[PDB]
Amino acid sequence: TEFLKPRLVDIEQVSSTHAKVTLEPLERGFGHTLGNALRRILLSSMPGCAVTEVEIDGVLHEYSTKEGVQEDILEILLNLKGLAVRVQGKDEVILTLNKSGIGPVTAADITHDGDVEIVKPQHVICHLTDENASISMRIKVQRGRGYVPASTRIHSEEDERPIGRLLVDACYSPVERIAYNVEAARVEQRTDLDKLVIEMETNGTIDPEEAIRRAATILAEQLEAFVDLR
Amino acid sequence: GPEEITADIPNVGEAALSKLDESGIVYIGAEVTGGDILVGKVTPKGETQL
Amino acid sequence: GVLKIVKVYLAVKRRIQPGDKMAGRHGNKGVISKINPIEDMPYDENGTPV
Missing domain, CATH: 2.170.120.12 (DNA-directed RNA polymerase, insert domain)
Incomplete structure (x- = not known):
């Protein structure tokens, strides 16, 4: 197919509290979907x-x-x-x-x-x-x-x-405040892909990459009741 | 008869009396929920028809 | 007619619940309807939720 898969490429550390995470490539409309799902998961279910x-x-x-x-x-x-x-x-x-x-x-x-x-x-x-x-x-x-x-x-x-x-x-919950925005990803033969940048602010006790990994794992676990159970 | 304040109370489990001292007064700082016995008071009972 | 009086002081910490009267300084009163999760409410582009 023509589908493309998101990849975690950059973890920009503003400080010990503020973190920047970039996810790309993202297809049309997937940026906001993934961003909102990740934001709702991270603000509610982080140990x-x-x-x-x-x-x-x-x-x-x-x-x-x-x-x-x-x-x-x-x-x-x-x-x-x-x-x-x-x-x-x-x-x-x-x-x-x-x-x-x-x-x-x-x-x-x-x-x-x-x-x-x-x-x-x-x-x-x-x-x-x-x-x-x-x-x-x-x-x-x-x-x-x-x-x-x-x-x-x-x-x-x-x-x-x-x-x-x-x-x-x-x-x-260690997460205090997160936000995300969607820009345009740069691909030589595809000028329509999007890139998701998720901003995370929290105390310590959480590495941003491991937090996003945990959120993805829990989202997949929740979807497991939909993949094959009708 | 005069009423007496005491930890000796009929038909009450010792669990409810755990927060009372030997004098029948709840300790200072003891967390207490609704229905517990803050101070144990006993009144003389009159003659009852059986 | 009394022998002794025992005064017990109870400190109750009360949190906010749906039903408490909230009002401003301009005559705009109201009653808390529901408690909303933090991730459930409107947020601006910076991420701070009202």
């Missing part, structure tokens, strides 16, 4: 790691305060919610943070592990105002996809949790 459970010594609930800490425990949990963590081997990781002194607390102060990658070591997490003030915190990170409120996890798990097991909402 990622997010902070889900935080334990702090001497703290019973999230509506209390600790001496020497400038902000409140709610602010601590909201700062934890925006932690960009990448886990290679396993799916559930316990993280430990210990700090004592005067000055801001960043993600670099977490006791680093061999299988945990911290994207932003300068991401501030807490502020200490008293030299004798010390903060010890245990952070639990699982891996998942989508958005999980604090009700589903407690409903699903039936075991009792001790007082102080502070639960935070998990935003597993």
Whole structure:
């Protein structure tokens, strides 16, 4: 036939957050179809790691305060919610943070592990105002996809949790914003092919090429119910 | 008779009493859902027809 | 006539749901109808969705 097949040819890295991916050649009308399908998949079904459970010594609930800490425990949990963590081997990781002194607390102060990658070591997490003030915190990170409120996890798990097991909402999806545009591909004997450029902006923990590969695999898996099942 | 506040409550499983201390008061910071017992109160029961 | 009073303070965190009254500063009130997925709403050429 006269059909042509898309090929991933260029991965332009604007920065550690912004990425450009080019796909070509594309036939008439396939650019927008593939772009919209890829955008709907990438914004909804990309796995990622997010902070889900935080334990702090001497703290019973999230509506209390600790001496020497400038902000409140709610602010601590909201700062934890925006932690960009990448886990290679396993799916559930316990993280430990210990700090004592005067000055801001960043993600670099977490006791680093061999299988945990911290994207932003300068991401501030807490502020200490008293030299004798010390903060010890245990952070639990699982891996998942989508958005999980604090009700589903407690409903699903039936075991009792001790007082102080502070639960935070998990935003597993690492993709923040993507967009695409279609231009004209350059072929010497075919001046009608199109080229698809997909712009992706996210935190770390996701390589753009592997994300697009995952989206293609899931789309093909979904279509597998249509290829032969009528 | 005077009413008493206690964790000793008839025909209630220990699961509902897990969030109460020995004095019958829920601990501070204990997550509680609808229907749980925040404080166990016992009132003397009058004579009942059988 | 009372012996002791126990006050218990409960903190409820309430998120937004279809049904809550949202209003602006110009008399244009309304009620949340449905919760839309992020990928489901209009976006501009830059990709930012309203």
